[PDB]
Design a protein around this nucleic acid. Structure first.
Length: 30
DNA sequence: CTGCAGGGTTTTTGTACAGCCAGACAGTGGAGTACTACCACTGTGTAAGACAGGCCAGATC
């Protein structure tokens, strides 16, 4: 199933890390 | 269908290495900063009526 997902605005940095890891990598690559 | 209970799910939340830059700390001697009282001194209240006594005008007899 899964937990009721995040609403942005509420967290500290490392949930944020794989929240965007793949886009930051696409950016690095660009 | 409700109730709770093993675990699932994905996701949190932080600890784990190790290197490293930033800016705070502390000094200074005083700079010139910034914020402080202090000083006399101000601006906005804004127009009518009531009441007493005179006394002359003029009606009434």
């Amino acid at each position: 199933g899964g937990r009721p997902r995040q609403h942005l605005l509420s967290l500290t940095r490392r949930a944020q890390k794989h929240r965007l890891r793949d886009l930051k990598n696409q950016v690095k690559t660009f």
